[PDB]
Amino acid sequence: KIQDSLSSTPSALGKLQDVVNHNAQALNTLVKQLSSKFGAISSVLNDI
Amino acid sequence: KIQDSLSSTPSALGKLQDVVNHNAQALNTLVKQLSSKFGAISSVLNDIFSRLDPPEAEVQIDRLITGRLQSLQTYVTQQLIRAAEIRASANLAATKMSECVLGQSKRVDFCGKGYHLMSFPQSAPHGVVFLHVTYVPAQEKNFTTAPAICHDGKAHFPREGVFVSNGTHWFVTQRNFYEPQIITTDNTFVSGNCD
Amino acid sequence: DCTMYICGDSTECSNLLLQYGSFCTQLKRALTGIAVEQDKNTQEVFAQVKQIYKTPPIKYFGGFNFSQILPDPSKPSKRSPIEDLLFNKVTLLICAQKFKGLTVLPPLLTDEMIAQYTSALLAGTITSGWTFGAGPALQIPFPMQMAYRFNGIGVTQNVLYENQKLIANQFNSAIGKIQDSLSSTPSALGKLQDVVNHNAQALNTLVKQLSSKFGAISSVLNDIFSRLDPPEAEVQIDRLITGRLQSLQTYVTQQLIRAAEIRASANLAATKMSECVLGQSKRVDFCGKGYHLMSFPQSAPHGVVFLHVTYVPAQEKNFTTA
Amino acid sequence: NFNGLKGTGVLTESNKKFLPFQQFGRDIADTTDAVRDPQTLEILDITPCSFGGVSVITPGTNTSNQVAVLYQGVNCTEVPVAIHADQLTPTWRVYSTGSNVFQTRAGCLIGAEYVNNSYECDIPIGAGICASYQTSQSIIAYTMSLGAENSVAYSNNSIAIPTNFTISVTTEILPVSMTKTSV
Numbered sequence: 001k002i003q004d005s006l007s008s009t010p011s012a013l014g015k016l017q018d019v020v021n022h023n024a025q026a027l028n029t030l031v032k033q034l035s036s037k038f039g040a041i042s043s044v045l046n047d048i
Numbered sequence: 049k050i051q052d053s054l055s056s057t058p059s060a061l062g063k064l065q066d067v068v069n070h071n072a073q074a075l076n077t078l079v080k081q082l083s084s085k086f087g088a089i090s091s092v093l094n095d096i097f098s099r100l101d102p103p104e105a106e107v108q109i110d111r112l113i114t115g116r117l118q119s120l121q122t123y124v125t126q127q128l129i130r131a132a133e134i135r136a137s138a139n140l141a142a143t144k145m146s147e148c149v150l151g152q153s154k155r156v157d158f159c160g161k162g163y164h165l166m167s168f169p170q171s172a173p174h175g176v177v178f179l180h181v182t183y184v185p186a187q188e189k190n191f192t193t194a195p196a197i198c199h200d201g202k203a204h205f206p207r208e209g210v211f212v213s214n215g216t217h218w219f220v221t222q223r224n225f226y227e228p229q230i231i232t233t234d235n236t237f238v239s240g241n242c243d
Numbered sequence: 244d245c246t247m248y249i250c251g252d253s254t255e256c257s258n259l260l261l262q263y264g265s266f267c268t269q270l271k272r273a274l275t276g277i278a279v280e281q282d283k284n285t286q287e288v289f290a291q292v293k294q295i296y297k298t299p300p301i302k303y304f305g306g307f308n309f310s311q312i313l314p315d316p317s318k319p320s321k322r323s324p325i326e327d328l329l330f331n332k333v334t335l336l337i338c339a340q341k342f343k344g345l346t347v348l349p350p351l352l353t354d355e356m357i358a359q360y361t362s363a364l365l366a367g368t369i370t371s372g373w374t375f376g377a378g379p380a381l382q383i384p385f386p387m388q389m390a391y392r393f394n395g396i397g398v399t400q401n402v403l404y405e406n407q408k409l410i411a412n413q414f415n416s417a418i419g420k421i422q423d424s425l426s427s428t429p430s431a432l433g434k435l436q437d438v439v440n441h442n443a444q445a446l447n448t449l450v451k452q453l454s455s456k457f458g459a460i461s462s463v464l465n466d467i468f469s470r471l472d473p474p475e476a477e478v479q480i481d482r483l484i485t486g487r488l489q490s491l492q493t494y495v496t497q498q499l500i501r502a503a504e505i506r507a508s509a510n511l512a513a514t515k516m517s518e519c520v521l522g523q524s525k526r527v528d529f530c531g532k533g534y535h536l537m538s539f540p541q542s543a544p545h546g547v548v549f550l551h552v553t554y555v556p557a558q559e560k561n562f563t564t565a
Numbered sequence: 566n567f568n569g570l571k572g573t574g575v576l577t578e579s580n581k582k583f584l585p586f587q588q589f590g591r592d593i594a595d596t597t598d599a600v601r602d603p604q605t606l607e608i609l610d611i612t613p614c615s616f617g618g619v620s621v622i623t624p625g626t627n628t629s630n631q632v633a634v635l636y637q638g639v640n641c642t643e644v645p646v647a648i649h650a651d652q653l654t655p656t657w658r659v660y661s662t663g664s665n666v667f668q669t670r671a672g673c674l675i676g677a678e679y680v681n682n683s684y685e686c687d688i689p690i691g692a693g694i695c696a697s698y699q700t701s702q703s704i705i706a707y708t709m710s711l712g713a714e715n716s717v718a719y720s721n722n723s724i725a726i727p728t729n730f731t732i733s734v735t736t737e738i739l740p741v742s743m744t745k746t747s748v
């Protein structure tokens with residue numbers, strides 16, 4: 001009964017899905033924080 | 049005796065009291081940086097916009113909004129340290145109530161001082177308090193001991209306990225309570241000669 | 244210190260630093276909490292008993308040898324030779340370069356009474372057995388106190404007495420290989436030598452940020468006060484103030500994470516001394532590899548060393564079963 | 566002010582030797598510790614003194630109002646020399662010549678006498694010395710009492726077996742949760 005217990009519902013293996021997602025949108029927000037001006041003229045360095 | 053003990057001194061409930069004072073004094077410190085100057089001209093927001101240049105005012109409010117956010121950023125970091133400390137004890141509390149309460153634990157000095165018998169949980173604000181019913185020995189006497197015995201040219205070792213002599217006649221008793229019995233083959237097992 | 248580290252011998256920072264609010268009172272409170280947590284850890288790891296027991300005058304222990312672990316009366320310090328080998332390998336004159344407010348507070352328990360606590364635990368675990376941690380101390384001879392450690396393993400006690408002499412020299416020589424194995428490799432105290440290095444690296448590199456420019460024109464305060472006027476010197480020094488307080492906050496945050504690590508290690512060490520010394524733990528691979536009999540604690544600089552007297556079967560033989 | 570350098574330390578004599586062109590000394594941690602006098606080419610030495618924490622060893626407010634000021638790490642053959650106006654940022658200039666001092670490893674404490682008994686510790690201080698409140702009421706300092714030296718009558722034939730028992734109820738307290746906060 002174990003294979004039908006884990007294969008049917010997708011909530012059986014959430015304890016690793018949230019682990020591999022905690023280091024997924026952390027990287028995405030780290031990329032997205034370059035777009036912030038931080039009280040400057042522009043978010044890119046070459047044009048200024 | 050516990051109801052007199054828990055109210056005689058304030059140190060009995062000091063651990064849960066310290067828990068609620070850290071979360072109270074964190075917010076008491078937190079509001080006090082709202083009135084902090086942070087090197088600006090004022091703490092009230094509308095005083096910056098009253099006379100300054102609006103491009104210069106946005107620079108002035110940038111160094112103030114970062115100072116207010118850094119006080120909040122420090123606060124979230126301080127709660128994350130404290131949330132990991134309580135989780136180290138909550139997993140210990142779940143370990144205690146699944147071993148001391150729902151069974152008898154043979155761990156020495158874990159579910160109470162000395163030998164442990166059972167426990168009782170009680171509900172307290174922001175935590176839990178136990179009543180670890182233990183079992184601790186009392187007054188004792190000392191005797192003369194031999195590690196073995198031999199009667200028919202053959203060594204005999206105890207089935208349980210230890211041989212104890214009171215001075216004239218030997219006895220075998222339990223290891224944690226004085227209960228002497230006469231030496232019998234039901235109380236011993238044989239292994240080799242006695243040389 | 245708040246003002247001494249950032250703007251030492253600078254009175255004109257005093258109105259400039261105190262206007263930030265109650266920022267470094269939190270820093271001092273956090274470091275005071277770490278300082279009292281170190282003393283709490285040292286109190287709850289070692290002091291499991293309140294009666295300081297004493298070793299007997301004669302040192303015969305049923306044919307065994309414990310000369311290396313008991314304190315030597317010939318030395319002026321009441322320590323053992325194992326602490327003599329352990330103290331020389333741990334290295335650090337390094338406190339004289341800390342004139343910028345970083346004052347290393349001494350521990351409450353000095354280095355001599357910790358050795359007295361370890362001597363008391365040793366005198367308990369040789370002469371009393373496990374009963375001194377669970378009420379009044381009951382003295383027991385050692386050739387019978389070992390005979391109730393096989394009985395919690397799975398072998399009956401008919402193999403200790405009749406093989407007494409053969410188990411004596413097999414143990415004593417097992418002490419001797421500990422004497423040179425600590426000096427055989429430098430990694431033997433690698434669990435401790437890094438830790439004193441962790442405060443060696445962090446305290447040194449805390450100094451070099453105030454030597455850095457941090458985006459300003461000079462790392463010292465007098466010359467920028469001299470050649471440039473105070474009506475536009477706050478816009479030059481706010482960078483230095485913010486960078487120095489941010490570096491101090493980062494150092495204190497790393498100190499909090501390291502102290503949480505030391506706390507998690509210290510609770511484990513207290514559990515180990517609570518059941519691998521004051522009894523006989525049945526958990527496999529907790530008090531050494533294989534079956535566990537007993538253990539001996541030994542003091543160490545900013546740590547502890549356990550000697551687990553384990554048990555390993557050998558020379559298997561084939562048989563046919565039913 | 567030697568050749569454009571700023572500092573407020575003492576000027577003593579050191580045994581270190583400079584090169585004829587190497588003028589300014591330094592250390593590992595980037596501190597100024599040695600200069601050369603232009604007029605005379607002898608070797609100098611720079612170190613500052615002194616700083617340290619100040620603690621108030623006090624009992625409860627309703628008990629009394631007397632104090633015991635501690636000085637962390639500072640050798641107190643120096644603080645009675647430093648009794649001067651505009652030199653002591655603490656206000657009590659007359660407290661440096663007060664009661665009988667006792668010297669510890671962490672620095673001597675001023676305002677408390679010493680006793681040589683074996684008492685339990687109430688207010689820990691450090692390095693095996695701590696204070697309490699005792700009776701003629703004054704703050705004292707003493708040595709740690711680690712308990713009575715209980716003996717062991719160990720032999721090669723002696724067992725000790727209890728004949729009675731007392732069931733006790735010991736209470737321990739553990740936190741579980743924390744006040745939830747949203748911002």
Ligand SMILES: *[C@@H]1O[C@H](CO)[C@@H](O)[C@H](O)[C@H]1NC(C)=O
Nearest residue numbers: 189190191192716717718723
């Ligand atoms: C029992 O112990 C006491 C002290 O603990 C000692 O004086 C006495 O001689 C002991 N009794 C025997 C029979 O050894």
Ligand SMILES: *[C@@H]1O[C@H](CO)[C@@H](O)[C@H](O)[C@H]1NC(C)=O
Nearest residue numbers: 213214215216217218219228
């Ligand atoms: C030992 O116990 C036995 C049985 O109670 C008794 O007959 C004997 O007199 C006792 N001897 C001593 C020395 O107490």
Ligand SMILES: *[C@@H]1O[C@H](CO)[C@@H](O)[C@H](O)[C@H]1NC(C)=O
Nearest residue numbers: 302303304306307308309310
């Ligand atoms: C214990 O061993 C040391 C050397 O390892 C030896 O000098 C000493 O005599 C021994 N003691 C006993 C009681 O055998």
Ligand SMILES: *[C@@H]1O[C@H](CO)[C@@H](O)[C@H](O)[C@H]1NC(C)=O
Nearest residue numbers: 557558559560561562563564
């Ligand atoms: C037991 O016998 C098998 C087959 O003869 C052999 O492979 C194995 O090594 C033997 N075990 C031992 C411990 O000698």
Ligand SMILES: *[C@@H]1O[C@H](CO)[C@@H](O)[C@H](O)[C@H]1NC(C)=O
Nearest residue numbers: 568601602603604605606607
């Ligand atoms: C400075 O003048 C004094 C007095 O003549 C002299 O003794 C000293 O050597 C001079 N030092 C230098 C470096 O010229």
Ligand SMILES: *[C@@H]1O[C@H](CO)[C@@H](O)[C@H](O)[C@H]1NC(C)=O
Nearest residue numbers: 639640642668669670672673
């Ligand atoms: C203070 O200096 C004297 C000078 O010899 C020394 O003997 C004493 O040990 C020093 N005390 C401290 C606490 O440094």
Ligand SMILES: *[C@@H]1O[C@H](CO)[C@@H](O)[C@H](O)[C@H]1NC(C)=O
Nearest residue numbers: 186187727728729730731732
């Ligand atoms: C054990 O202690 C209790 C508590 O006072 C007492 O009433 C009882 O008589 C004692 N029993 C023995 C056998 O000493």
